[PDB]
Structure formats: structure tokens, C-alpha cells
Enzyme design. Structure first.
Site, short mmCIF file in Angstrom:
data_model
loop_
_atom_site.label_atom_id
_atom_site.label_comp_id
_atom_site.label_asym_id
_atom_site.label_seq_id
_atom_site.Cartn_x
_atom_site.Cartn_y
_atom_site.Cartn_z
N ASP A 88 -12.32 9.93 -7.70
CA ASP A 88 -13.63 10.26 -7.08
C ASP A 88 -13.47 11.41 -6.10
OD1 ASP A 88 -12.54 9.22 -4.76
OD2 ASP A 88 -13.67 7.30 -4.91
N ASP A 121 -15.44 -4.49 8.56
CA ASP A 121 -16.50 -3.82 7.75
C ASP A 121 -17.13 -4.83 6.78
OD1 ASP A 121 -17.81 -1.23 6.68
OD2 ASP A 121 -16.60 -1.65 4.90
N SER A 162 -11.62 11.50 -3.48
CA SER A 162 -11.08 11.03 -2.17
C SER A 162 -9.57 10.86 -2.31
CB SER A 162 -11.71 9.72 -1.71
OG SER A 162 -11.36 8.65 -2.54
N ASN A 174 -8.88 5.54 3.23
CA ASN A 174 -9.65 6.42 2.31
C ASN A 174 -10.46 7.53 3.01
OD1 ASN A 174 -10.62 6.52 -0.65
ND2 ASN A 174 -12.44 6.51 0.62
N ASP A 181 -6.24 8.51 -0.33
CA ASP A 181 -5.81 7.42 0.60
C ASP A 181 -4.59 7.91 1.37
OD1 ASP A 181 -7.80 5.79 -0.49
OD2 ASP A 181 -6.43 5.26 -2.16
N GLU A 192 0.84 -1.20 0.00
CA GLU A 192 0.00 0.00 0.00
C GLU A 192 0.87 1.24 0.00
OE1 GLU A 192 -3.15 0.40 -0.44
OE2 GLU A 192 -3.93 -1.60 -0.13
N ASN A 232 -7.54 9.89 -5.61
CA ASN A 232 -8.44 9.07 -6.45
C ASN A 232 -9.30 10.00 -7.31
OD1 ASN A 232 -8.63 7.39 -3.42
ND2 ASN A 232 -7.53 6.56 -5.17
#
EC number: 3.2.1.17
Lengths: 240, 129
Positions: B48, B101, B50, B59, B52, B35, B46
Site C-alpha cells: 500500500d 487505539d 507504507s 506503520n 513499517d 516484528e 508494504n
């Protein structure tokens, strides 16, 4: 003072420009935790850290005083110093041939090590402990006192942090220093060992193997009543 | 900060991640490698809108608040800046929520593509742990 303008001045290659801005940041960072937070919030720490590489010793001294003062704040403020990458340069500065620069770096480390266990852990991971143990043999009594305060702070952590101090070979020097003619050196050595003695049975057993018990017993009757109580209390933690 | 392998393994073990939700410590070290390359300050923007953040690339739409991501839920109740610290506490506490989650470690795309199914205990062999 305009903190943002001070911080931008640290983008300068001009060594006279760098020294005046560093001096002002350091003074502000001496004014308590809200002032420290203003210095942090303005983006001072990356440039203060890069400047620990200045071949110019007066710039280095000022940057260390600024960082040292910031590291006198709360655990989140200490953590910002860590996050900015101060520790490796601070540990390298323990090898400075300049004793003033050494003292200042040692003070900054001591202050970072006066935080919580995560702040202590950062100091251990950066490789301070063998240097601090070496410095217990310094001819300079100020250096020795500051190295003992930093070790004592590290030894105030959790059992693994204590065990890092034991593993760095602190105990012989510390037991030896309980014989110092200097009462402040004695009190600091005693504090360090007392913190080590608050660890688990392995840590207590190492303190006993190093011959602390005979000397702590002797110190219950030292002329200074604060030393008597410190020694009586260390003994109680070991006997436990 | 760029962690060393065993340095991060020991930090993650001290923070309770070894066999958290049945994922051995090697999974978490491998996930961090792929990562962030062990870089606590790693960030990825990203499409969108967002981002990370940090060692485990958490995120800004679902988990942390960066104040610039539309549709943000801040389920870890944490500023995204805390997830860039060398003190990995907040990234670990958030990771423990993420892993719970419903998807286990499949939440970490780089884990699913580089670590899942591999000999992940290689990431911890040699460490004092």
C-alpha cells in the site's frame, strides 16, 4: 568543501584517499553544532564507524577525532553517533596498544557519556564501565584523567546508571584517587564521587562503605578553595 | 543495533511498558522478537506504499511520517526515522498510543500470530527485573 563528495570518498579502498577525506570531515565537525549537523546530514557516520576497523592507525586516529567532534554536539547529535554503531568499536579501542588511539577513543566515549541518560545508558550497555575502572590504574596521567571524566559523566545519570558505576567497582579507586598529588585528578575523583553521592540511600551508603567520608572531611580544608567547596558539598549530599 | 533479550526487556521496563494497558513486559519483548528480530533498524515495505519501521514495526500510513506514504496521518506526530534509533523512547511512546487505539496488541500482526496466548513471560525469565 563539498560534504557529499567527502562522504563518497570514504567508499574508496585507497588508504591515501580515505585519509585526506577523514581529515576534512574532522575539521568541519570541529566548527560547532550546525557544521556537525551538515556532516551528519551528508551521511558521514556509517563510513566513519566502519573505518574504526581500519588496520591503518592514521586513518583510525582521524576517524576517531571526527566522531569525537560530532559527539561534542547536542544529545540528538550524540544519539546519531550511537545509532551509527560507534560504541562497540570505541570500547574495543580502549584495549589498543597505541596510547594515542586509546586517548582518542576514551575522549570520544567521554563525549558520548556527556549526553542525557539515554546516551549514558548506551555507553553502559556497550560495556565501557569495567574498562574505564581498569584505566583508573593507568601509569599515563592523561589516560587516567580522561577515564575519570568519562566515569564522572556516566555517574551524572539516574540512580540505575550510578549503581552500574558502583557495580563496576569504581568506588575503591575513586576514594584512593582523592589522595592524588595531582590536583586535577583529585578534583575529577571528587566530582565523580559527588555525582554518585547524588543518588539514592543505597548509592550514598555504598560511598560511605568505601571510606569516602573520612577523606572528604579532610578535603574541606584543602589549600584550594574550589576543592574545599566541592568536598563540603559532596559531604552535604552524603550526610543527606 | 540488535538488542539482547534482557537488554530490551530492561529498556522497555525503564520506559514504562511493563503491564502498560495490562500487557506484561513479556508480550512487548515477544512482539519485538517476531516484528524486528530485536533489530532497531528493521524496515518492511508494504504493497500500500507504507513502510513499517523499527523494533516494533510502526506503520508510516497511520503513525509516523516518512514523507513518502500517501494517505498518511502521522498520529504519533513523529518522523519514522526516530523510530529507528537505539534510543527506544520514540518507538515506546508511539507503541503506547498504538496499544490504546482500540485493539490492544492485536495492532501488531506478528504478536497476534506468534506471541498471543503463549507463555510470554519466558521472554523475561532470567532478566534482572
Amino acid at each position: 568543501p563539498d560534504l557529499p563528495k567527502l562522504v563518497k570518498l570514504l567508499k574508496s579502498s585507497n588508504e591515501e584517499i580515505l585519509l585526506k577525506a577523514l581529515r576534512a570531515l574532522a575539521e568541519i565537525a570541529s566548527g560547532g553544532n550546525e557544521q556537525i549537523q551538515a556532516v551528519i546530514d551528508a551521511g558521514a557516520l556509517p563510513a566513519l564507524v566502519q573505518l574504526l576497523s581500519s588496520p591503518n592507525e592514521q586513518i583510525l586516529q582521524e576517524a576517531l577525532w571526527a566522531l569525537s567532534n560530532i559527539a561534542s554536539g547536542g544529545n540528538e547529535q550524540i544519539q546519531a553517533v550511537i545509532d551509527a554503531g560507534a560504541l562497540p568499536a570505541l570500547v574495543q579501542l580502549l584495549s589498543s596498544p597505541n596510547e594515542q588511539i586509546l586517548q582518542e577513543a576514551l575522549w570520544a566515549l567521554s563525549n558520548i557519556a556527556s549526553g542525557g541518560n539515554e546516551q549514558i545508558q548506551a555507553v553502559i550497555d556497550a560495556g565501557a564501565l569495567p574498562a574505564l575502572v581498569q584505566l583508573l590504574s593507568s601509569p599515563n596521567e592523561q589516560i587516567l584523567q580522561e577515564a575519570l571524566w568519562a566515569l564522572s559523566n556516566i555517574a551524572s545519570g539516574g540512580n540505575e546508571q550510578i549503581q552500574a558505576v558502583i557495580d563496576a567497582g569504581a568506588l575503591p579507586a575513586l576514594v584512593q584517587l582523592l589522595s592524588s598529588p595531582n590536583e586535577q585528578i583529585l578534583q575529577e575523583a571528587l566530582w565523580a564521587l559527588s555525582n554518585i553521592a547524588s543518588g539514592g540511600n543505597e548509592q550514598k551508603q555504598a560511598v560511605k562503605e568505601a571510606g569516602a567520608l573520612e577523606k572528604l572531611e579532610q578535603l574541606q580544608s584543602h589549600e584550594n578553595e574550589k576543592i574545599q567547596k566541592e568536598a563540603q558539598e559532596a559531604l552535604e549530599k552524603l550526610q543527606s | 543495533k540488535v538488542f539482547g533479550r534482557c537488554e530490551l526487556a530492561a529498556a522497555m521496563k525503564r520506559h514504562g511498558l511493563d503491564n502498560y494497558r495490562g500487557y506484561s513486559l513479556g508480550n512487548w519483548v515477544c512482539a519485538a522478537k517476531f516484528e524486528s528480530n530485536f533489530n532497531t533498524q528493521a524496515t518492511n515495505r508494504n504493497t500500500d506504499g507504507s513502510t513499517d519501521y523499527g523494533i516494533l514495526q510502526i506503520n508510516s500510513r497511520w503513525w509516523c511520517n516518512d514523507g513518502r506514504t500517501p494517505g498518511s496521518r502521522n498520529l504519533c506526530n513523529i518522523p519514522c526515522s526516530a523510530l529507528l534509533s537505539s534510543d527506544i523512547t520514540a518507538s515506546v511512546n508511539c507503541a503506547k498510543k498504538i496499544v490504546s487505539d482500540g485493539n490492544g496488541m492485536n495492532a501488531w500482526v506478528a504478536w497476534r500470530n506468534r506471541c498471543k496466548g503463549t507463555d510470554v513471560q519466558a521472554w523475561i525469565r532470567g532478566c534482572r527485573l
